[PDB]
Design a protein around this ligand. Structure first.
Ligand SMILES: N#Cc1ccc(C(=O)Nc2ccc(F)c([C@@]3(CF)N=C(N)OCC3(F)F)c2)nc1
Ligand code: NA
Ligand code: NA
Length: 371
Protein backbone atom coordinates (compact mmCIF):
# COMPACT_ATOMS: atom_id res chain seq x y z
CA UNK A 1 0.00 0.00 0.00
CA UNK A 2 1.23 3.63 -0.81
CA UNK A 3 4.58 2.49 -2.43
CA UNK A 4 4.94 0.93 -5.95
CA UNK A 5 8.41 1.71 -7.27
CA UNK A 6 8.13 -0.93 -10.00
CA UNK A 7 5.16 0.91 -11.59
CA UNK A 8 6.55 4.47 -11.49
CA UNK A 9 7.31 5.78 -14.99
CA UNK A 10 5.61 2.77 -16.72
CA UNK A 11 3.76 5.05 -19.22
CA UNK A 12 5.23 6.54 -22.39
CA UNK A 13 3.92 8.49 -25.36
CA UNK A 14 4.47 11.31 -27.90
CA UNK A 15 2.67 14.65 -27.93
CA UNK A 16 -0.76 14.25 -29.48
CA UNK A 17 -0.59 10.45 -29.46
CA UNK A 18 -1.76 9.32 -26.00
CA UNK A 19 -0.14 7.48 -23.11
CA UNK A 20 0.54 3.77 -23.50
CA UNK A 21 1.63 1.03 -21.17
CA UNK A 22 3.52 -2.17 -22.14
CA UNK A 23 1.55 -5.37 -21.88
CA UNK A 24 2.05 -9.03 -22.75
CA UNK A 25 -0.64 -11.27 -24.23
CA UNK A 26 -0.61 -15.09 -24.82
CA UNK A 27 1.89 -17.91 -24.14
CA UNK A 28 4.61 -17.42 -24.78
CA UNK A 29 4.16 -13.74 -24.02
CA UNK A 30 3.87 -11.30 -26.93
CA UNK A 31 4.83 -7.74 -25.95
CA UNK A 32 2.53 -4.90 -27.13
CA UNK A 33 2.19 -1.22 -26.28
CA UNK A 34 -1.37 -0.42 -25.39
CA UNK A 35 -2.99 2.97 -25.10
CA UNK A 36 -4.50 3.68 -21.57
CA UNK A 37 -8.14 4.77 -22.06
CA UNK A 38 -10.42 5.54 -19.02
CA UNK A 39 -13.08 6.55 -21.58
CA UNK A 40 -13.89 3.05 -22.88
CA UNK A 41 -14.14 -0.57 -21.69
CA UNK A 42 -12.76 -3.00 -24.34
CA UNK A 43 -9.31 -4.43 -24.43
CA UNK A 44 -8.71 -4.44 -28.13
CA UNK A 45 -5.40 -4.99 -30.02
CA UNK A 46 -4.37 -5.03 -33.63
CA UNK A 47 -4.16 -8.70 -34.81
CA UNK A 48 -3.24 -8.21 -38.50
CA UNK A 49 -0.32 -6.51 -40.33
CA UNK A 50 -1.83 -3.04 -40.67
CA UNK A 51 1.05 -0.93 -42.12
CA UNK A 52 0.97 1.71 -39.28
CA UNK A 53 1.61 -1.02 -36.64
CA UNK A 54 4.97 -1.90 -35.19
CA UNK A 55 3.76 -5.17 -33.62
CA UNK A 56 0.37 -7.00 -33.53
CA UNK A 57 -1.19 -9.95 -31.71
CA UNK A 58 -0.58 -13.20 -33.54
CA UNK A 59 -3.15 -15.59 -31.98
CA UNK A 60 -1.69 -18.58 -33.85
CA UNK A 61 1.45 -18.28 -31.65
CA UNK A 62 -0.39 -18.48 -28.34
CA UNK A 63 -1.11 -21.90 -26.85
CA UNK A 64 -3.48 -20.28 -24.32
CA UNK A 65 -5.77 -18.39 -26.77
CA UNK A 66 -9.42 -19.38 -26.69
CA UNK A 67 -11.88 -18.29 -29.31
CA UNK A 68 -15.24 -16.89 -28.27
CA UNK A 69 -16.64 -17.44 -31.85
CA UNK A 70 -18.16 -13.95 -31.90
CA UNK A 71 -17.31 -10.85 -33.99
CA UNK A 72 -17.65 -7.23 -32.85
CA UNK A 73 -18.13 -4.08 -35.00
CA UNK A 74 -17.29 -0.82 -33.14
CA UNK A 75 -17.99 2.50 -34.85
CA UNK A 76 -16.97 5.76 -33.14
CA UNK A 77 -17.67 9.32 -34.33
CA UNK A 78 -14.70 9.35 -36.64
CA UNK A 79 -13.22 5.91 -37.06
CA UNK A 80 -14.09 2.30 -36.42
CA UNK A 81 -12.66 -1.13 -35.85
CA UNK A 82 -13.91 -4.69 -36.09
CA UNK A 83 -12.50 -7.80 -34.47
CA UNK A 84 -12.89 -11.34 -33.25
CA UNK A 85 -13.38 -11.95 -29.54
CA UNK A 86 -11.40 -14.46 -27.50
CA UNK A 87 -9.63 -14.75 -24.09
CA UNK A 88 -5.97 -15.21 -23.44
CA UNK A 89 -3.43 -14.76 -20.63
CA UNK A 90 -2.45 -11.13 -20.06
CA UNK A 91 0.04 -9.43 -17.86
CA UNK A 92 1.67 -6.01 -17.28
CA UNK A 93 5.49 -6.29 -17.03
CA UNK A 94 5.78 -2.92 -15.11
CA UNK A 95 2.73 -3.69 -13.04
CA UNK A 96 1.44 -6.17 -10.50
CA UNK A 97 3.06 -9.51 -10.62
CA UNK A 98 0.08 -11.57 -11.84
CA UNK A 99 -1.34 -13.10 -15.02
CA UNK A 100 -5.06 -13.00 -15.77
CA UNK A 101 -7.35 -14.59 -18.35
CA UNK A 102 -8.97 -11.60 -20.08
CA UNK A 103 -11.27 -10.88 -22.97
CA UNK A 104 -9.34 -9.53 -26.03
CA UNK A 105 -10.84 -8.21 -29.21
CA UNK A 106 -8.42 -9.13 -32.02
CA UNK A 107 -8.80 -6.18 -34.41
CA UNK A 108 -8.81 -7.48 -37.99
CA UNK A 109 -10.06 -4.27 -39.79
CA UNK A 110 -10.02 -0.60 -38.76
CA UNK A 111 -10.43 2.93 -40.21
CA UNK A 112 -9.08 6.15 -38.60
CA UNK A 113 -8.28 4.24 -35.45
CA UNK A 114 -4.47 3.60 -35.37
CA UNK A 115 -2.20 6.63 -35.59
CA UNK A 116 0.41 6.67 -38.38
CA UNK A 117 3.75 7.15 -36.54
CA UNK A 118 2.57 6.20 -33.06
CA UNK A 119 4.14 3.47 -31.02
CA UNK A 120 0.99 1.70 -29.71
CA UNK A 121 -1.03 -1.07 -31.26
CA UNK A 122 -4.06 -1.54 -29.05
CA UNK A 123 -6.31 0.05 -26.44
CA UNK A 124 -7.01 -0.83 -22.79
CA UNK A 125 -10.51 0.36 -21.88
CA UNK A 126 -10.46 0.90 -18.12
CA UNK A 127 -14.10 2.01 -17.65
CA UNK A 128 -17.06 -0.23 -16.67
CA UNK A 129 -18.89 -3.19 -18.33
CA UNK A 130 -21.94 -1.07 -19.05
CA UNK A 131 -20.21 0.62 -22.06
CA UNK A 132 -18.29 -2.52 -23.18
CA UNK A 133 -19.06 -3.68 -26.76
CA UNK A 134 -21.00 -5.58 -27.89
CA UNK A 135 -22.75 -5.53 -24.53
CA UNK A 136 -22.10 -5.60 -20.83
CA UNK A 137 -21.55 -9.25 -20.41
CA UNK A 138 -18.08 -8.80 -22.04
CA UNK A 139 -16.15 -8.38 -18.81
CA UNK A 140 -13.51 -5.51 -19.09
CA UNK A 141 -9.86 -6.15 -18.29
CA UNK A 142 -9.75 -4.50 -14.87
CA UNK A 143 -12.83 -6.40 -13.66
CA UNK A 144 -11.08 -9.65 -14.68
CA UNK A 145 -7.90 -8.54 -12.95
CA UNK A 146 -9.68 -7.81 -9.72
CA UNK A 147 -11.83 -11.06 -9.78
CA UNK A 148 -8.92 -13.39 -10.46
CA UNK A 149 -6.22 -11.90 -8.20
CA UNK A 150 -5.82 -10.04 -4.92
CA UNK A 151 -5.01 -6.72 -6.68
CA UNK A 152 -7.19 -4.09 -4.91
CA UNK A 153 -10.01 -2.53 -6.88
CA UNK A 154 -8.39 0.83 -7.74
CA UNK A 155 -5.77 2.30 -10.08
CA UNK A 156 -4.22 5.69 -10.35
CA UNK A 157 -2.80 7.77 -13.28
CA UNK A 158 -0.12 10.41 -13.29
CA UNK A 159 0.07 11.80 -16.94
CA UNK A 160 3.16 14.07 -17.37
CA UNK A 161 2.71 16.22 -20.49
CA UNK A 162 5.37 17.31 -23.05
CA UNK A 163 7.81 12.79 -25.62
CA UNK A 164 5.48 12.37 -22.67
CA UNK A 165 5.48 9.88 -19.79
CA UNK A 166 3.74 9.08 -16.55
CA UNK A 167 2.71 6.28 -14.21
CA UNK A 168 -0.20 3.94 -14.03
CA UNK A 169 -0.28 2.51 -10.48
CA UNK A 170 -2.38 -0.61 -10.58
CA UNK A 171 -3.95 -1.62 -7.25
CA UNK A 172 -2.79 1.35 -5.27
CA UNK A 173 -1.60 4.88 -4.79
CA UNK A 174 2.00 6.12 -4.72
CA UNK A 175 2.37 9.22 -2.52
CA UNK A 176 5.59 10.43 -4.12
CA UNK A 177 3.53 11.18 -7.29
CA UNK A 178 1.53 14.09 -5.82
CA UNK A 179 1.72 16.98 -3.40
CA UNK A 180 -0.76 18.23 -0.79
CA UNK A 181 -3.90 16.19 -0.28
CA UNK A 182 -6.17 14.05 -2.42
CA UNK A 183 -9.81 15.35 -2.75
CA UNK A 184 -12.50 12.93 -3.87
CA UNK A 185 -15.59 13.36 -6.06
CA UNK A 186 -18.26 10.55 -6.25
CA UNK A 187 -18.56 8.43 -9.34
CA UNK A 188 -22.15 9.18 -10.20
CA UNK A 189 -22.70 5.99 -12.13
CA UNK A 190 -20.40 3.13 -13.08
CA UNK A 191 -20.32 3.24 -16.91
CA UNK A 192 -17.87 5.97 -17.94
CA UNK A 193 -16.06 7.50 -14.97
CA UNK A 194 -18.93 9.93 -14.61
CA UNK A 195 -18.58 12.92 -12.19
CA UNK A 196 -20.50 16.12 -11.49
CA UNK A 197 -19.12 19.66 -12.01
CA UNK A 198 -20.90 22.16 -9.80
CA UNK A 199 -19.26 25.46 -10.71
CA UNK A 200 -16.79 26.81 -13.32
CA UNK A 201 -14.51 29.81 -12.91
CA UNK A 202 -12.25 31.63 -15.34
CA UNK A 203 -9.56 33.44 -13.39
CA UNK A 204 -11.70 33.32 -10.29
CA UNK A 205 -14.78 34.74 -12.13
CA UNK A 206 -17.77 32.51 -12.09
CA UNK A 207 -19.50 31.71 -15.38
CA UNK A 208 -22.79 31.78 -13.43
CA UNK A 209 -24.50 29.27 -15.67
CA UNK A 210 -27.14 26.87 -14.43
CA UNK A 211 -24.85 24.03 -13.22
CA UNK A 212 -26.91 21.38 -15.05
CA UNK A 213 -25.40 22.92 -18.24
CA UNK A 214 -21.95 21.79 -17.04
CA UNK A 215 -22.92 18.14 -17.12
CA UNK A 216 -25.14 18.16 -20.18
CA UNK A 217 -25.55 15.23 -20.77
CA UNK A 218 -22.63 13.84 -18.56
CA UNK A 219 -19.14 14.82 -17.42
CA UNK A 220 -16.44 12.19 -17.47
CA UNK A 221 -12.74 11.70 -16.74
CA UNK A 222 -11.12 10.33 -20.01
CA UNK A 223 -7.37 9.59 -20.49
CA UNK A 224 -8.17 8.61 -24.09
CA UNK A 225 -9.04 12.26 -25.13
CA UNK A 226 -6.57 15.08 -25.39
CA UNK A 227 -8.87 18.07 -24.93
CA UNK A 228 -11.01 19.51 -22.23
CA UNK A 229 -14.34 19.21 -24.07
CA UNK A 230 -17.25 21.40 -22.83
CA UNK A 231 -20.98 21.26 -23.64
CA UNK A 232 -21.57 23.78 -26.49
CA UNK A 233 -23.32 26.47 -24.31
CA UNK A 234 -20.60 26.21 -21.65
CA UNK A 235 -17.84 26.29 -24.23
CA UNK A 236 -19.36 29.51 -25.69
CA UNK A 237 -19.53 31.20 -22.24
CA UNK A 238 -16.04 29.95 -21.31
CA UNK A 239 -14.33 31.19 -24.54
CA UNK A 240 -15.98 34.62 -24.18
CA UNK A 241 -14.31 34.84 -20.66
CA UNK A 242 -10.96 33.54 -21.66
CA UNK A 243 -10.99 35.86 -24.75
CA UNK A 244 -11.86 38.78 -22.52
CA UNK A 245 -9.24 37.86 -19.88
CA UNK A 246 -6.50 37.65 -22.62
CA UNK A 247 -7.82 40.56 -24.69
CA UNK A 248 -4.39 42.29 -24.59
CA UNK A 249 -3.29 40.12 -27.49
CA UNK A 250 -5.85 39.42 -30.28
CA UNK A 251 -5.84 36.10 -32.20
CA UNK A 252 -7.85 34.91 -35.16
CA UNK A 253 -11.41 33.73 -34.24
CA UNK A 254 -10.24 30.51 -35.92
CA UNK A 255 -7.74 29.98 -33.07
CA UNK A 256 -10.46 29.68 -30.39
CA UNK A 257 -12.14 27.05 -32.54
CA UNK A 258 -9.05 24.86 -32.76
CA UNK A 259 -9.04 25.64 -36.56
CA UNK A 260 -5.71 27.46 -36.63
CA UNK A 261 -2.54 27.47 -34.56
CA UNK A 262 -0.94 30.44 -32.90
CA UNK A 263 2.89 30.90 -32.79
CA UNK A 264 5.32 33.07 -30.89
CA UNK A 265 9.14 33.50 -31.19
CA UNK A 266 10.71 30.64 -29.13
CA UNK A 267 10.95 30.95 -25.32
CA UNK A 268 8.51 33.95 -25.36
CA UNK A 269 5.02 32.37 -24.95
CA UNK A 270 3.19 35.00 -22.73
CA UNK A 271 1.48 32.45 -20.36
CA UNK A 272 0.64 35.29 -17.93
CA UNK A 273 -1.90 36.85 -20.31
CA UNK A 274 -4.03 33.69 -20.27
CA UNK A 275 -6.40 32.98 -17.35
CA UNK A 276 -6.48 29.86 -15.05
CA UNK A 277 -9.58 27.67 -15.33
CA UNK A 278 -11.24 26.06 -12.23
CA UNK A 279 -13.76 23.29 -12.03
CA UNK A 280 -15.51 22.75 -8.76
CA UNK A 281 -16.46 19.11 -8.37
CA UNK A 282 -19.07 17.59 -6.07
CA UNK A 283 -17.43 16.47 -2.82
CA UNK A 284 -17.92 13.45 -0.51
CA UNK A 285 -20.06 15.41 1.93
CA UNK A 286 -23.53 17.02 1.54
CA UNK A 287 -23.16 20.68 0.46
CA UNK A 288 -19.36 20.27 0.21
CA UNK A 289 -17.27 20.69 -2.96
CA UNK A 290 -13.59 21.19 -3.89
CA UNK A 291 -11.95 22.96 -6.81
CA UNK A 292 -9.25 21.85 -9.31
CA UNK A 293 -7.44 24.66 -11.19
CA UNK A 294 -5.48 24.28 -14.39
CA UNK A 295 -3.05 26.53 -16.26
CA UNK A 296 -2.68 27.65 -19.84
CA UNK A 297 0.39 25.34 -19.84
CA UNK A 298 -2.30 22.63 -19.84
CA UNK A 299 -4.86 23.99 -22.30
CA UNK A 300 -2.45 25.54 -24.91
CA UNK A 301 -0.82 22.36 -26.40
CA UNK A 302 2.57 22.73 -28.20
CA UNK A 303 2.37 21.36 -31.75
CA UNK A 304 6.69 27.69 -30.84
CA UNK A 305 3.17 27.01 -32.14
CA UNK A 306 0.15 26.07 -30.01
CA UNK A 307 -3.32 24.65 -30.43
CA UNK A 308 -6.12 25.85 -28.13
CA UNK A 309 -7.25 22.51 -26.54
CA UNK A 310 -10.58 23.34 -24.96
CA UNK A 311 -13.28 22.52 -27.43
CA UNK A 312 -17.07 22.25 -27.79
CA UNK A 313 -18.77 18.88 -27.25
CA UNK A 314 -22.06 17.24 -27.97
CA UNK A 315 -21.30 14.42 -25.52
CA UNK A 316 -20.95 16.30 -22.21
CA UNK A 317 -17.82 17.51 -20.49
CA UNK A 318 -14.72 15.42 -21.16
CA UNK A 319 -11.87 15.93 -18.69
CA UNK A 320 -9.17 14.65 -21.09
CA UNK A 321 -5.39 14.95 -20.82
CA UNK A 322 -5.77 18.78 -20.64
CA UNK A 323 -7.22 18.29 -17.12
CA UNK A 324 -5.37 15.07 -16.10
CA UNK A 325 -1.90 16.30 -16.84
CA UNK A 326 -2.32 18.76 -13.94
CA UNK A 327 -3.14 16.11 -11.34
CA UNK A 328 -2.57 12.74 -9.87
CA UNK A 329 -5.95 11.02 -10.43
CA UNK A 330 -7.16 8.10 -8.36
CA UNK A 331 -9.86 5.82 -9.91
CA UNK A 332 -11.08 4.44 -6.57
CA UNK A 333 -13.52 1.92 -7.91
CA UNK A 334 -13.87 0.05 -4.61
CA UNK A 335 -15.37 3.22 -3.03
CA UNK A 336 -17.02 4.63 -6.25
CA UNK A 337 -15.06 7.88 -6.13
CA UNK A 338 -12.32 9.76 -8.08
CA UNK A 339 -9.48 11.54 -6.17
CA UNK A 340 -7.49 14.50 -7.41
CA UNK A 341 -4.23 15.85 -6.07
CA UNK A 342 -1.65 18.25 -7.57
CA UNK A 343 0.67 16.16 -9.70
CA UNK A 344 4.35 16.15 -8.66
CA UNK A 345 5.26 16.25 -12.38
CA UNK A 346 2.84 18.87 -13.86
CA UNK A 347 4.10 21.65 -16.26
CA UNK A 348 4.00 25.10 -14.56
CA UNK A 349 5.93 28.39 -14.23
CA UNK A 350 7.43 30.47 -11.40
CA UNK A 351 4.09 32.38 -10.87
CA UNK A 352 1.21 29.92 -10.97
CA UNK A 353 0.69 26.20 -10.28
CA UNK A 354 -2.13 23.72 -10.82
CA UNK A 355 -4.11 23.48 -7.53
CA UNK A 356 -6.66 21.26 -5.77
CA UNK A 357 -8.37 23.18 -2.82
CA UNK A 358 -11.33 22.71 -0.44
CA UNK A 359 -13.70 22.40 1.23
CA UNK A 360 -16.11 24.92 -0.32
CA UNK A 361 -19.78 25.27 0.49
CA UNK A 362 -21.97 24.56 -2.55
CA UNK A 363 -25.74 24.07 -2.30
CA UNK A 364 -28.06 22.05 -4.61
CA UNK A 365 -25.21 20.00 -6.11
CA UNK A 366 -27.61 17.15 -6.86
CA UNK A 367 -29.51 19.39 -9.26
CA UNK A 368 -26.28 19.71 -11.33
CA UNK A 369 -26.69 16.17 -12.63
CA UNK A 370 -28.56 15.65 -15.88
CA UNK A 371 -31.08 12.79 -16.14
N1 LIG B 1 -3.31 13.23 -24.57
C1 LIG B 1 -3.77 12.49 -25.27
C2 LIG B 1 -4.35 11.56 -26.17
C3 LIG B 1 -3.98 11.65 -27.56
C4 LIG B 1 -4.52 10.71 -28.41
C5 LIG B 1 -5.36 9.74 -27.90
C6 LIG B 1 -6.02 8.78 -28.78
O1 LIG B 1 -5.64 8.54 -29.93
N2 LIG B 1 -7.12 8.22 -28.21
C7 LIG B 1 -7.99 7.30 -28.80
C8 LIG B 1 -7.67 6.62 -29.97
C9 LIG B 1 -8.62 5.77 -30.52
C10 LIG B 1 -9.85 5.60 -29.90
F1 LIG B 1 -10.78 4.77 -30.44
C11 LIG B 1 -10.17 6.30 -28.68
C12 LIG B 1 -11.52 6.07 -28.00
C13 LIG B 1 -11.78 4.57 -28.02
F2 LIG B 1 -12.93 4.36 -27.21
N3 LIG B 1 -11.47 6.40 -26.59
C14 LIG B 1 -11.88 7.58 -26.16
N4 LIG B 1 -11.76 7.88 -24.85
O2 LIG B 1 -12.49 8.51 -26.91
C15 LIG B 1 -12.37 8.45 -28.34
C16 LIG B 1 -12.58 6.99 -28.68
F3 LIG B 1 -12.59 6.91 -30.03
F4 LIG B 1 -13.87 6.68 -28.38
C17 LIG B 1 -9.23 7.11 -28.15
N5 LIG B 1 -5.70 9.71 -26.59
C18 LIG B 1 -5.26 10.60 -25.71
NA1 NA C 1 -9.66 -9.96 -5.91
NA1 NA D 1 2.76 13.27 -1.54
Amino acid sequence: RGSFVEMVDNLRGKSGQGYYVEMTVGSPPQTLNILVDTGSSNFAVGAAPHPFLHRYYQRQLSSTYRDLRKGVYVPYTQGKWEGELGTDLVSIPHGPNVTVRANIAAITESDKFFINGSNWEGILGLAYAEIARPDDSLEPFFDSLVKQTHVPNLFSLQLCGASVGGSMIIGGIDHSLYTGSLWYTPIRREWYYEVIIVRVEINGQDLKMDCKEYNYDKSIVDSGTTNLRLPKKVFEAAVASIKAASSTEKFPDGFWLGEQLVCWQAGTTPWNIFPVISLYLMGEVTNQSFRITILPQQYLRPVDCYKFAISQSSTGTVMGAVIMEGFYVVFDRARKRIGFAVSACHVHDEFRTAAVEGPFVTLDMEDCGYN
